[PDB]
Amino acid sequence: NKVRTDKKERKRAFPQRGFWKKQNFLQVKNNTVRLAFAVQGVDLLKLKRLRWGEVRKGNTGWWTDDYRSP
Amino acid sequence: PRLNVFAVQWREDGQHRIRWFRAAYGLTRAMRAAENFRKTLEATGRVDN
Amino acid sequence: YWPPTRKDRSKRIRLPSGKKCFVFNAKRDQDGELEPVLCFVDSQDNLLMWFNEEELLEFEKLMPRLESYYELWEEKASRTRMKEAIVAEAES
Amino acid sequence: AVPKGKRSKHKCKQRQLIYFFDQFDGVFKRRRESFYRSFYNPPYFSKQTEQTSLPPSVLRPFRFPGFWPGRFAFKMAS
Amino acid sequence: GNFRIKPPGARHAFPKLGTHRMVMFRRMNLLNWPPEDASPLHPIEPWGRQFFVFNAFATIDPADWCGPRGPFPRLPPLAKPAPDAATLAASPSSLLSALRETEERSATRTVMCVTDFAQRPLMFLGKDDFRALRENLPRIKEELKAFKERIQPNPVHAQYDLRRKLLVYPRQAMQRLKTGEHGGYGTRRGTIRERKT
Amino acid sequence: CLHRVNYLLNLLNASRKKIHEQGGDISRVYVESYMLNIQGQIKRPQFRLRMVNLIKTWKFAVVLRFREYPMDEYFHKLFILKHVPRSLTTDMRLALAGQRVGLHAVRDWYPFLDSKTRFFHRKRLKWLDRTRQFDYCLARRVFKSKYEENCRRRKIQVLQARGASDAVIEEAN
Amino acid sequence: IELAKNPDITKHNLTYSGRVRAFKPPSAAQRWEMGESKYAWRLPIPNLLAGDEMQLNPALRIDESTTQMFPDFSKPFFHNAHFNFSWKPEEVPFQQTVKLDITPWRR
Amino acid sequence: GWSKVVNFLNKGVQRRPHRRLPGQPHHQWNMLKTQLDQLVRSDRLELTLPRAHELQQYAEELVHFAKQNTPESSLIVESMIFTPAARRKLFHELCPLYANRPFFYTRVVNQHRLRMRDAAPMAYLEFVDRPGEIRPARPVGFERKQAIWEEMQATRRGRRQWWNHAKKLGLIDEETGDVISDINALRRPSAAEWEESDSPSPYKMVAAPKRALEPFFVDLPPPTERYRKQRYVFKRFRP
Amino acid sequence: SSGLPNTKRRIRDPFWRRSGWWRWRQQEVKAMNRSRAFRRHLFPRFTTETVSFVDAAE
Amino acid sequence: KIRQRIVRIRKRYMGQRIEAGLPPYVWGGPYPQYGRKRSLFIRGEMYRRMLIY
RNA sequence: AUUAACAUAACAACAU
RNA sequence: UUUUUUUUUUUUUUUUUUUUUUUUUUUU
């Protein structure tokens, strides 16, 4: 509970090895959001990955700089 | 469904008797074994009529 | 295995572009089974793709249609050069 | 079973050193030697951390400039 | 493009269930793969393989080329520079417009392309190549038919049959159900009861 | 390769940076001792089949002391005692292996290069001493002069790297 | 700061809540009453109005990237491929019916 | 623990040839099988040292049985791959490569570092004689002979050391008792090469180091850059 | 080696030794260690003065 | 385990064809009968009745 | 800011 | 190729087999 009123803190006391990861569902959700922005034509992943002070117009990256020697 | 096995019902000397047939080895194999057992019963003449 | 010896391929057919092609038995991607295959290679002898009898027969049917496109698109291509040059040679 | 009495300070003290030696001879000493070997090789660079991490490097710095002969810096060009 | 930029309505106009779910995700990555000026794709029956004719961008002469760079060498394109900042400042266009400026390429190289089910480039063919390939078609059918005869069956089946005929084949038990207080005897018998008149 | 050791690591790094900014020579700084102070505890509930245990967490404060070794002291520990740190020797060996120095440096660092060289050097030192051949004061002066000259050249070259004028260089040093 | 917070750009594509499955009742156009006809395009009267201004032919607005080729009736094929309705076309050959056997042992 | 138990228990214990893996045998074999295909598709994989020492056992056998070019061997090779891309690469890029290599096509490199999250050792499992390799590989075949001859001709010590060995290879002229002068005379055609079968076009390909280049520019990122996806998605906590 | 610490390691014990580490033996061992330690120094043969350290605030 | 394996390949193939956009063709052969109840026939009557109403 | 229990450190020792 | 008794061999030595410790060093 958000209010923190139930007995949900009992189990947490004991140590655990690991927990589930809903990757399958999360991936789908992310994909749907990505699609919803792509139909408009804006890259979200690109902006979520670019270096702080980095400028990359369009579909460009490290690879772009290879052939662009001059 | 729960036992996951075939059964054969036949009457002998006015008494009901059922035999087990595990289908773990194969569905078709168990089905054919049960059918052959019933046919053997009828051929040897151990079913009331 | 890849390199076909003299006794495992037919005569190579050279193209104007330098691309070569031959007929040999190739392991299909399905299961790796040998079947009659039409292998295509570039100038540097690199595998690009392959077909089979079915594919080739299918493609032969479609070839006529594709030819019209070559003539059609050419016009466009030509006209784009005129559109670029008319302004390149009049306002440079 | 259950303890019959309380452990003295002395015992604990002894145990402390015992444990420290035990650990040192088997964990720490091995780790130190493993760490020190990597120096010869270039540092490790992670692809994941590229967003914030500094560019790759090979050359190692010198912590003791007092015993560092030879040139330290190059004169500026005209 | 496989998608309409800035489409009308408040919802997608295409299915988003089944295989289409995957296809949308696959195609969203590449919003510009299919040239605006391209012939319709023509897939083949057996294996997903499409054909289409398009126009490619020009390139700089190899003479003027620096050299291969990076793990994927590629020749540079032939394009003019964008307007400079000094001219863009005086231009009446907005900042948004000015920032969004790009180069200008020349599309005058007509070529035929073959892709997979996924519209993945595989090979490129020109007019001369296509014309040359047509003259060798009859010579290739005979070679294919001749080579078809060299294939032989798989000896796997025969070896397995001989193996099973002249070898042992142990079989283990399955479904060893336990029992409670009362044990089993292979067969069971029912009960008999009388009616109450 | 621990997690909770980061807390100590940060203190170490901050102390080194502060001492360097204060102008002290970090190459002559040693850890004297330490001190631990209890702060408190944070207890938590823990239910069981027939009881309710109490789980808690530790909280401690670490106090560290640093001391700088004068030249005199430094000399006696490295030249005589041969109690050189490991970092220095590793650096030296690295440079030697990588060919970052000439053939002249190997011999110069021979007294402090390897354990075998240190031991043989110390034995020769003892023999020299017994033979009335070794001068303590002369060796100390040579040591100190070499160290000070290297330190001075480092700063002079660093200042020259910026392209400063001769007057600026003379006023700085 | 949060690029995901763009309701204007994303439009109704997202739910902005814990709605895994969206709900959309039938549209006005979709409904029978006051709904667009499936056969009114070919009428004479609408074309009059639509003079060099709009094409009412539905065959000129079919997506090519999400449509399959026309199969053969003789050959097995799906119903949903092109049949956008709920009635079997007369073109389709006769189809047989299969009845489940509940007591096959009686044979 | 105590660090002493490890030693006490280990006394008189034999080493295991095959390292144990988490799961049933059927699972373990599957795991190793899939990792072999993934190794074939990459050229280097980063794995734990124990696991790197284990996968190399099958990494060698795959290439050993791929070079036979027999129906029987083909079956065994088939029995060790999943995806078609790995089959294609193994049969089109690796088989030609190791034409002259008797064995030992892989190696293991220790990183001498511990994982941040696990404190575990790390290692690299990279193929031999591949682009961007960690270290160069030695020559084989005629290359080896040329190297040896070069070594011999360099200095006297080499000559002396290789004297015995050279005899077998035929680099010593028995008619004069001296090292062979012309080394190109020992050139032979390898399997990797193409046997002899016996333009003014504008669309001509341009020679370039790995593969040729087309005379046209196509707006397309590399194969490894045209398919993006989030590596991991955060899972919000439920307090 | 490979994912396994060496089995033939030697772990020191500060309070026990196979050769004997009794109270009586400790004395001797300490004595010898101290004796050896002391001798490792090399003091000058000639000095002009000796100056000690003192803390005025303390 | 084998059935769950074959299903995947079948599905994959079919999906590939759908992506390709080829004519919709299936295996027109004798299919099995995993069902037992006449759900479709029993269901039609309810709609008939409802309509009547 | 604050006593004890409790926790750590520095100095002091030689007939051993 | 490994393990085991369901196989095989011995039933002798005890100042023997074996072993962690060179002791004229009476105040390390």
Side-chain angles (χ1 to χ4, degrees), chain A, chain B, chain C, chain D, chain E, chain F residues 1-136 138-150 152-173, chain G, chain H, chain I, chain J:
Chain A
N1 189 14
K2 198 162 182 175
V3 188
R4 315 200 187 196
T5 56
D6 60 354
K7 308 172 188 181
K8 211 180 179 186
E9 70 191 358
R10 297 191 182 192
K11 195 183 179 186
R12 301 174 182 157
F14 307 85
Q16 311 305 136
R17 205 165 179 275
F19 315 106
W20 299 326
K21 305 165 188 180
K22 299 286 175 186
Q23 292 292 294
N24 189 33
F25 186 80
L26 293 162
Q27 288 284 340
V28 179
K29 192 178 73 172
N30 195 62
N31 292 330
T32 51
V33 180
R34 289 205 302 155
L35 186 61
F37 275 105
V39 293
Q40 300 300 326
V42 305
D43 204 333
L44 195 76
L45 194 59
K46 192 188 74 172
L47 296 172
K48 278 190 173 188
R49 303 209 300 196
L50 60 84
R51 212 192 165 76
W52 172 252
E54 192 168 18
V55 171
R56 297 288 184 181
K57 304 178 191 177
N59 197 352
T60 58
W62 63 272
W63 58 267
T64 322
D65 311 343
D66 293 349
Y67 71 93
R68 301 195 183 288
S69 93
Chain B
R2 191 188 74 82
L3 314 147
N4 202 31
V5 299
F6 289 90
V8 193
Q9 302 188 86
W10 78 100
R11 296 200 77 82
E12 186 165 20
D13 305 343
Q15 307 204 70
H16 192 200
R17 300 187 181 279
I18 316 97
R19 193 183 163 196
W20 212 242
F21 285 84
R22 303 206 303 286
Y25 302 86
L27 197 81
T28 56
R29 197 161 195 157
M31 196 174 189
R32 289 173 182 166
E35 293 173 353
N36 290 352
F37 183 63
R38 178 68 187 205
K39 290 170 185 177
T40 310
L41 290 169
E42 290 176 357
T44 58
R46 288 185 8 234
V47 184
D48 311 33
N49 283 296
Chain C
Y1 147 76
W2 148 251
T5 62
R6 192 172 289 160
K7 304 171 191 168
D8 299 315
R9 65 180 210 270
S10 76
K11 195 175 186 179
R12 299 181 291 184
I13 293 149
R14 310 174 191 284
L15 308 167
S17 92
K19 295 158 174 149
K20 327 99 176 189
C21 62
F22 59 90
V23 180
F24 96 118
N25 272 225
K27 296 169 183 189
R28 72 196 190 163
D29 295 358
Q30 290 70 44
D31 59 0
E33 292 187 4
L34 301 171
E35 281 189 354
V37 168
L38 183 65
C39 187
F40 283 77
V41 286
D42 65 350
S43 64
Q44 288 192 347
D45 316 306
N46 295 289
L47 183 67
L48 301 165
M49 65 155 184
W50 30 269
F51 307 85
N52 58 9
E53 190 172 352
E54 185 171 10
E55 292 192 319
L56 194 72
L57 290 166
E58 286 291 293
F59 176 63
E60 181 166 320
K61 305 170 186 176
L62 205 69
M63 287 206 315
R65 190 169 224 65
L66 300 156
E67 190 169 37
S68 80
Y69 306 158
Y70 274 102
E71 190 172 29
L72 181 48
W73 296 93
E74 276 173 332
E75 274 290 306
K76 307 178 173 191
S78 310
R79 294 182 190 215
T80 45
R81 285 193 289 274
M82 294 180 187
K83 271 199 170 182
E84 287 182 341
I86 201 81
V87 71
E89 296 181 14
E91 302 206 327
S92 183
Chain D
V2 188
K4 197 71 166 170
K6 187 175 177 180
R7 191 166 288 161
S8 74
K9 238 285 179 192
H10 175 226
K11 293 285 190 175
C12 310
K13 282 189 177 181
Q14 298 177 329
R15 293 185 70 77
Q16 193 66 58
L17 195 76
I18 300 150
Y19 196 69
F20 168 74
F21 268 104
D22 173 72
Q23 296 294 285
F24 184 88
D25 297 325
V27 179
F28 316 136
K29 190 166 75 181
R30 194 188 182 204
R31 291 181 184 168
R32 198 220 196 186
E33 282 164 357
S34 294
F35 169 77
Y36 272 107
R37 218 299 200 164
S38 78
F39 279 40
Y40 286 96
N41 314 320
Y44 177 67
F45 182 78
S46 187
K47 300 179 179 179
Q48 316 313 316
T49 61
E50 71 196 345
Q51 193 171 5
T52 62
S53 194
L54 279 61
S57 191
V58 171
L59 191 69
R60 302 279 183 163
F62 216 91
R63 305 136 157 193
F64 294 84
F67 308 92
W68 178 236
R71 180 153 286 273
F72 298 94
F74 289 106
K75 177 172 272 280
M76 182 170 282
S78 61
Chain E
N2 289 298
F3 310 95
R4 187 174 172 173
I5 314 303
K6 296 277 274 291
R11 292 184 195 77
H12 297 147
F14 43 80
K16 64 185 181 180
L17 305 165
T19 68
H20 300 105
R21 210 184 71 189
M22 294 197 172
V23 182
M24 293 297 101
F25 308 150
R26 194 174 298 151
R27 287 178 178 174
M28 67 180 187
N29 299 96
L30 301 162
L31 303 163
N32 76 300
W33 157 235
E36 198 196 324
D37 55 334
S39 89
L41 288 60
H42 295 97
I44 62 161
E45 201 73 53
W47 316 118
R49 288 178 168 166
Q50 293 179 356
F51 309 76
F52 78 100
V53 195
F54 79 100
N55 301 334
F57 306 110
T59 189
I60 299 149
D61 190 294
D64 303 0
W65 184 38
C66 184
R69 305 286 172 162
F72 309 117
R74 201 200 300 196
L75 277 158
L78 191 66
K80 283 179 177 176
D84 54 308
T87 61
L88 291 167
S91 184
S93 62
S94 65
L95 296 154
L96 190 64
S97 303
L99 301 178
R100 302 176 64 76
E101 290 292 342
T102 74
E103 68 181 27
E104 303 180 347
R105 304 162 184 161
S106 314
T108 64
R109 289 285 188 188
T110 192
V111 290
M112 187 180 80
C113 185
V114 49
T115 76
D116 69 343
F117 67 91
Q119 307 173 342
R120 305 185 191 97
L122 312 168
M123 196 176 177
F124 304 86
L125 287 156
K127 196 177 186 182
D128 55 353
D129 305 341
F130 180 79
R131 280 192 174 186
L133 183 63
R134 290 188 74 163
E135 294 187 350
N136 287 280
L137 275 164
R139 280 185 168 178
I140 290 157
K141 289 171 174 184
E142 297 173 19
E143 297 278 29
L144 284 157
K145 289 176 186 184
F147 270 81
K148 188 170 181 171
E149 294 292 305
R150 302 181 189 196
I151 293 155
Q152 300 293 345
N154 199 321
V156 168
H157 307 102
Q159 287 294 315
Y160 179 81
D161 291 354
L162 185 60
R163 293 279 185 80
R164 285 293 303 281
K165 190 176 176 182
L166 300 170
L167 302 164
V168 181
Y169 194 87
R171 290 171 172 155
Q172 295 85 357
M174 302 187 176
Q175 269 200 348
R176 279 186 164 150
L177 300 174
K178 312 295 182 176
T179 190
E181 200 194 45
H182 303 281
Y185 293 95
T187 53
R188 287 177 61 197
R189 192 183 66 84
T191 79
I192 294 157
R193 298 188 158 87
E194 191 169 38
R195 278 175 56 182
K196 295 292 194 172
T197 314
Chain F
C1 203
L2 293 155
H3 304 166
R4 279 183 166 170
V5 177
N6 302 352
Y7 287 75
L8 310 160
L9 281 159
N10 286 339
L11 175 61
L12 288 162
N13 284 290
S15 301
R16 191 167 65 169
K17 191 184 170 182
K18 191 174 179 183
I19 292 158
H20 184 243
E21 282 185 12
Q22 283 286 7
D25 190 5
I26 64 105
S27 314
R28 325 194 317 276
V29 175
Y30 298 75
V31 175
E32 282 217 307
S33 74
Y34 67 94
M35 200 184 204
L36 312 172
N37 285 344
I38 192 73
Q39 288 200 269
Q41 293 144 75
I42 320 170
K43 309 194 180 178
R44 300 176 295 155
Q46 200 194 57
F47 299 79
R48 297 286 190 155
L49 179 56
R50 311 198 174 81
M51 58 187 170
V52 194
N53 304 340
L54 291 156
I55 209 165
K56 84 204 176 189
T57 323
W58 293 104
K59 260 189 164 192
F60 266 79
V62 180
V63 179
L64 308 169
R65 301 91 168 210
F66 317 89
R67 197 176 118 276
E68 196 200 69
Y69 285 34
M71 297 296 289
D72 308 339
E73 191 178 338
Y74 212 69
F75 169 75
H76 202 240
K77 185 165 183 155
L78 311 196
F79 205 80
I80 315 299
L81 296 163
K82 305 205 165 293
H83 294 162
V84 68
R86 202 209 166 103
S87 52
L88 176 50
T89 62
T90 310
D91 299 339
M92 297 188 290
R93 281 194 300 275
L94 286 159
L96 285 160
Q99 310 192 44
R100 293 182 64 187
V101 297
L103 309 171
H104 297 279
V106 66
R107 278 193 170 173
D108 192 35
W109 303 336
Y110 173 88
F112 335 97
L113 185 71
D114 303 289
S115 179
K116 303 291 188 182
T117 69
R118 283 178 232 139
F119 176 71
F120 292 125
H121 203 274
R122 188 167 59 77
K123 197 185 177 195
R124 190 152 287 174
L125 289 164
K126 260 190 178 172
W127 169 249
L128 273 53
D129 181 273
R130 299 319 185 205
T131 64
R132 275 58 172 185
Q133 297 186 87
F134 170 71
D135 189 15
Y136 185 87
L138 183 59
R140 187 164 68 169
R141 278 293 304 162
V142 175
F143 183 84
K144 292 201 293 191
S145 294
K146 197 184 287 188
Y147 193 86
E148 289 167 20
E149 287 283 296
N150 294 331
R152 183 180 163 202
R153 188 174 79 270
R154 194 201 77 76
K155 291 183 178 180
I156 287 160
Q157 286 197 0
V158 168
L159 270 167
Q160 282 181 347
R162 298 291 189 178
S165 297
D166 310 46
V168 176
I169 289 156
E170 285 181 352
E171 187 166 46
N173 296 89
Chain G
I1 292 158
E2 296 182 278
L3 303 171
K5 294 187 172 168
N6 278 286
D8 61 340
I9 293 161
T10 198
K11 302 187 185 189
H12 270 128
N13 295 304
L14 303 176
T15 55
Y16 319 102
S17 73
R19 254 196 177 82
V20 183
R21 181 166 167 165
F23 198 90
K24 200 220 170 191
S27 69
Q30 288 169 347
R31 297 184 178 285
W32 190 269
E33 297 85 338
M34 305 302 297
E36 194 179 288
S37 183
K38 293 182 181 175
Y39 84 98
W41 68 274
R42 62 165 201 271
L43 278 161
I45 190 152
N47 295 293
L48 192 64
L49 310 173
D52 310 336
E53 293 274 65
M54 194 191 294
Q55 291 178 314
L56 308 181
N57 190 358
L60 311 171
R61 211 181 315 90
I62 291 160
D63 194 326
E64 299 181 345
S65 70
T66 58
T67 305
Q68 314 197 74
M69 288 205 283
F70 300 113
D72 185 16
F73 309 140
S74 65
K75 314 298 185 176
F77 74 111
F78 282 96
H79 179 88
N80 65 66
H82 309 95
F83 312 137
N84 198 18
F85 46 78
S86 303
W87 46 269
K88 188 186 159 287
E90 286 171 294
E91 298 81 340
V92 188
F94 172 77
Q95 303 296 305
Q96 295 195 343
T97 308
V98 192
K99 294 286 185 170
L100 298 172
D101 194 359
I102 311 306
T103 62
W105 54 82
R106 296 202 198 288
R107 79 199 194 83
Chain H
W2 266 94
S3 210
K4 307 168 184 176
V5 70
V6 81
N7 295 358
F8 178 77
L9 303 170
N10 276 274
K11 186 176 178 176
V13 188
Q14 197 164 229
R15 300 296 107 209
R16 213 176 193 279
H18 301 85
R19 300 173 174 71
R20 299 194 194 78
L21 310 170
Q24 289 184 346
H26 67 92
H27 186 28
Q28 310 180 23
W29 176 232
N30 284 316
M31 175 51 70
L32 288 156
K33 205 175 164 180
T34 52
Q35 292 216 273
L36 183 60
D37 181 286
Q38 281 167 358
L39 182 72
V40 170
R41 276 185 280 157
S42 297
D43 305 287
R44 182 170 64 244
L45 291 178
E46 177 171 24
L47 301 168
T48 62
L49 188 73
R51 186 163 292 189
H53 275 300
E54 194 66 21
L55 189 60
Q56 203 189 14
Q57 175 164 357
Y58 310 103
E60 296 291 336
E61 184 173 43
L62 191 80
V63 191
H64 176 65
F65 278 112
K67 291 206 292 171
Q68 303 190 7
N69 190 36
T70 62
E72 306 190 332
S73 193
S74 307
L75 203 76
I76 292 158
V77 177
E78 291 169 36
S79 197
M80 295 180 74
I81 218 78
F82 285 108
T83 59
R87 198 204 321 285
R88 178 177 60 76
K89 190 162 176 189
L90 181 70
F91 288 108
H92 305 258
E93 301 188 44
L94 300 179
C95 268
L97 183 62
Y98 310 126
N100 306 319
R101 204 167 217 80
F103 212 66
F104 290 119
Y105 325 102
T106 67
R107 58 176 163 231
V108 178
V109 181
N110 193 348
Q111 300 180 12
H112 304 93
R113 71 185 199 76
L114 276 47
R115 200 141 66 198
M116 192 270 162
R117 66 173 225 276
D118 297 341
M122 301 300 292
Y124 287 115
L125 177 64
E126 188 179 69
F127 273 100
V128 177
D129 192 26
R130 283 251 66 204
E133 61 188 332
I134 291 158
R135 56 182 73 152
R138 282 119 68 80
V140 292
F142 171 74
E143 306 178 18
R144 195 183 179 253
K145 293 192 180 195
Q146 188 176 342
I148 299 153
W149 178 82
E150 196 188 337
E151 290 183 29
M152 293 182 79
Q153 289 288 349
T155 74
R156 303 178 292 281
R157 191 187 285 181
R159 191 172 65 202
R160 293 178 202 152
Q161 287 191 349
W162 301 100
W163 190 260
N164 288 357
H165 197 263
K167 290 187 288 180
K168 307 182 180 181
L169 307 179
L171 300 166
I172 290 156
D173 181 32
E174 298 179 43
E175 305 195 52
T176 57
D178 201 354
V179 188
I180 290 280
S181 309
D182 186 13
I183 197 71
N184 298 282
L186 309 178
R187 283 177 182 281
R188 303 289 181 275
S190 70
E193 296 169 79
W194 293 68
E195 292 183 319
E196 294 293 325
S197 180
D198 198 352
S199 69
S201 189
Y203 299 90
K204 203 166 188 181
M205 304 184 84
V206 182
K210 293 173 174 182
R211 285 180 166 64
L213 308 176
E214 289 286 6
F216 50 80
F217 179 78
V218 184
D219 200 354
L220 263 165
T224 63
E225 297 296 330
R226 57 180 168 206
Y227 297 109
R228 320 296 182 70
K229 57 159 176 282
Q230 193 158 329
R231 178 156 174 143
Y232 174 82
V233 199
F234 188 66
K235 175 164 158 55
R236 294 184 149 81
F237 197 84
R238 308 302 184 193
Chain I
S1 51
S2 307
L4 196 68
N6 182 18
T7 309
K8 305 297 185 174
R9 286 177 296 165
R10 302 293 192 167
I11 292 161
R12 294 177 290 182
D13 196 313
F15 312 121
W16 202 93
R17 297 193 180 186
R18 181 166 167 160
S19 65
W21 199 239
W22 312 282
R23 201 176 278 203
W24 74 271
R25 197 161 142 78
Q26 292 179 31
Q27 302 158 11
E28 300 182 354
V29 177
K30 192 187 180 75
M32 187 178 178
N33 284 344
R34 272 190 157 209
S35 183
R36 178 162 51 199
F38 170 71
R39 290 156 160 71
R40 200 174 168 155
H41 308 276
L42 302 165
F43 309 103
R45 301 179 181 286
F46 172 77
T47 53
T48 52
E49 195 165 44
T50 316
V51 195
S52 310
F53 188 81
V54 69
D55 193 2
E58 292 287 330
Chain J
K1 180 171 283 198
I2 293 156
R3 194 199 185 174
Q4 290 186 352
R5 188 161 182 71
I6 293 159
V7 287
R8 299 182 207 102
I9 293 154
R10 193 179 63 276
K11 293 187 84 176
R12 184 154 53 208
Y13 179 60
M14 301 299 284
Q16 290 173 2
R17 281 185 68 78
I18 291 161
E19 181 160 25
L22 273 162
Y25 290 131
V26 306
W27 174 69
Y31 290 83
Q33 184 64 42
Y34 300 125
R36 197 178 181 180
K37 319 192 177 189
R38 299 154 289 178
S39 155
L40 178 65
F41 292 109
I42 294 164
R43 190 168 63 265
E45 174 58 25
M46 193 182 72
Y47 306 147
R48 193 180 69 86
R49 289 177 288 156
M50 298 151 60
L51 297 154
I52 300 153
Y53 306 132

